[PDB]
């Protein structure tokens, strides 16, 4: 069964802004999603320091980037702490209501969109390039869930029956038709080297057939 939720008004406004503002430097979405994955990996690593059984669901801490030109999707996978159902409903584990307010005031005082991650809402930069985002996640303390939103004021949450993930988060970006450069190996490598050179986990870029 699928549950449908309305976004809080502030988040709907943030998403409408991201989608409708003219902003050419869209590549920053990948920097922000990788930073989120690195934070999620840090959290499970910290919890493992005092309870090593937290890693029973997978000892490898890494980030995988999976382009698929047939489906026009770019998937970002990490083996971080994952998100419970409550985390998903509460704006994917962010303080997005207060962060959105701070970000929109900053935009008034001479900030640009590339500063979004400094306000804790970098996930939503995915909508610079994606028409729909699917998030599949598994936290040690909960079941495997899928979150999805095309925007438009609502999101869905359902129990995921797909392949089990063990632990972590998969972000699936359904790219807009004019944003397919982010499926190209040379372009992804350029972005990772420019923005994510010092991330402290291995990043593997998968190849396509």
Swiss-Prot record:
Modification comment: ISGylated. S-nitrosylated; negatively regulates the ATPase activity and the activation of eNOS by HSP90AA1.
Positions where N6-acetyllysine occurs in the chain: 43, 69
Chain positions covered by the region annotation Interaction with NR3C1: 1-209
Subcellular location: Nucleus; Cytoplasm; Melanosome; Cell membrane
Domain notes: The TPR repeat-binding motif mediates interaction with TPR repeat-containing proteins like the co-chaperone STUB1.
Assigned protein family: Belongs to the heat shock protein 90 family.
Reported function: Molecular chaperone that promotes the maturation, structural maintenance and proper regulation of specific target proteins involved for instance in cell cycle control and signal transduction. Undergoes a functional cycle that is linked to its ATPase activity which is essential for its chaperone activity. This cycle probably induces conformational changes in the client proteins, thereby causing their activation. Interacts dynamically with various co-chaperones that modulate its substrate recognition, ATPase cycle and chaperone function.
Assembly mode: Homodimer. Identified in NR3C1/GCR steroid receptor-chaperone complexes formed at least by NR3C1, HSP90AA1 and a variety of proteins containing TPR repeats such as FKBP4, FKBP5, PPID, PPP5C or STIP1. Forms a complex containing HSP90AA1, TSC1 and TSC2; TSC1 is required to recruit TCS2 to the complex. The closed form interacts (via the middle domain and TPR repeat-binding motif) with co-chaperone TSC1 (via C-terminus). Interacts with TOM34. Interacts with TERT; the interaction, together with PTGES3, is required for correct assembly and stabilization of the TERT holoenzyme complex. (Microbial infection) Interacts with herpes simplex virus 1 protein US11; this interaction inhibits TBK1-induced interferon production.
Name this protein carries in UniProt: Heat shock protein HSP 90-alpha
Name of encoding gene: HSP90AA1
Part of the intact protein present: 16 to 224 of 732
